[PDB]
Design a protein around this ligand. Sequence first.
Ligand SMILES: Cn1c(=O)ccc2ccccc21
Length: 130
Amino acid sequence: SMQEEDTFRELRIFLRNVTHRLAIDKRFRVFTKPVDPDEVPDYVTVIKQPMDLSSVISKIDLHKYLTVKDYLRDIDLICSNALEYNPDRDPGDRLIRHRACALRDTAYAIIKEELDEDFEQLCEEIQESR
Ligand SMILES: Cn1c(=O)ccc2ccccc21
């Protein structure tokens, strides 16, 4: 119905806003764009599902997230990809990992403070029924 279309529109507005806030944080600059295959040629061969915040924005806009849980799975994927691709003890790898964890923690903290749980439940139930 139009009431359901309005729910999902509110979801998209909410998710763009959260993603924007992550995207303008200087710690998370590394996560704002897809990894450049010139800059990092073995990335695509190691990491099977690349994800970054620009792509998250494209996915919102393509109506790919029907719940906040589905969004958080992609935020999780940014983080897990960074942990897996950069596993070593050296400071380069530790910096990116720490940033990856801070990205994930921040996304979850914003959603905990700002997402109404009954709004998420509504989205899940509309999604369950389609
Ligand atoms: C996320 N990420 C990595 O996980 C590894 C290298 C790299 C290089 C440029 C930008 C992002 C990058």
